[PDB]
Ligand binder design. Structure first.
Ligand code: COA
Ligand code: NA
Ligand code: NA
Ligand code: NA
Ligand code: NA
Ligand code: NA
Ligand code: NA
Ligand code: NA
Ligand code: NA
Ligand code: NA
Ligand code: NA
Length: 225
């Protein structure tokens, strides 16, 4: 079983998390009939990864004692987790993953996987603030593609934020600061929210702490609130 995503999960709430990942689409996976409408008009690549990522979601939920069931799609694409559960899903070339948590210990999860590849510069200025572009090179080893790592953290931030607020969060609306561990391939980040953080219940979101990792040609990030 693969354990790349454990490199970005916390120990403090680990017993209330579970995860499952795969690196390709198993052949011949049939969609659940209740989930098939979600991909009824989708291209084959989207259908195949959707079915794999939902499979990972149910394996991870089963570890937390949740019986397998369909996971529908809600406001703005967000997955509809079973009662008492939270989680997040991601895919990219070579990666499909789910991390889920018990809501009584975990308020929200956001994860993202990317290929550890450059982004174009025009995609970088649209996805970053000036202070990020100044500070990332100061805090990240020169071997790493900081543009891509910053973007991966932006995506995990939106996924952790949206289920709590049900509002947009733009690339300009969170300033993310990083640190690198002395081993050079993992570290921590903090996403500072620059807009109103009001949530549907509980205290407003102001800073979201996460972890990042680069390995096996992938960037992984996770935020567990
Ligand atoms: C929604 C988004 C973050 C998804 O990320 P992605 O890199 O395109 O794709 P991933 O495979 O990593 O993640 C897709 C999964 O995200 C989840 N997701 C989609 N919308 C979501 C939402 N509103 N809230 C939480 N999770 C959501 C879904 O599980 C989806 O997979 P599924 O359709 O198979 O269920 C991205 O497409 C997007 O729209 N980003 C713009 C918002 C943003 O990044 N703001 C910057 C904040 S600092
Ligand atoms: Na457990
Ligand atoms: Na695999
Ligand atoms: Na559902
Ligand atoms: Na969610
Ligand atoms: Na990809
Ligand atoms: Na360094
Ligand atoms: Na600012
Ligand atoms: Na910050
Ligand atoms: Na930084
Ligand atoms: Na590592």
């Amino acid at each position: 079983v693969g354990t790349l995503v454990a490199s970005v999960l916390p120990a403090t709430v680990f017993e209330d998390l579970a995860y499952a990942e795969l690196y390709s689409d198993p052949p011949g996976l049939t969609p659940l009939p209740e989930e098939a409408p979600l991909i009824a008009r989708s291209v084959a690549k989207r259908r195949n990864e959707f079915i794999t990522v939902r499979h990972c979601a149910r394996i991870a939920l089963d570890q937390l004692g949740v019986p397998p069931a369909p996971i529908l799609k809600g406001d703005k694409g967000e997955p509809c987790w079973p009662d008492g559960m939270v989680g997040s899903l991601t895919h990219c070339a070579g990666y499909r993953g789910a991390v889920v948590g018990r809501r009584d210990a975990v308020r929200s999860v956001g994860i993202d996987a990317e290929p550890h590849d450059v982004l174009p510069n025009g995609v970088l200025d649209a996805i970053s603030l000036p202070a990020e572009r100044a500070d990332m090179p100061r805090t990240m080893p020169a071997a790493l593609h900081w543009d891509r790592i910053l973007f991966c953290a932006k995506e995990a931030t939106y996924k952790a934020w949206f289920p709590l607020t049900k509002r947009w969060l733009g690339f300009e609306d969170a300033h993310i600061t990083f640190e690198t561990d002395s081993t050079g391939w993992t570290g921590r980040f903090v996403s500072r929210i620059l807009i109103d953080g009001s949530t549907l219940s509980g205290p407003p979101l102001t800073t979201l702490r996460g972890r990042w990792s680069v390995e096996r040609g992938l960037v992984l990030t996770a935020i567990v609130l």
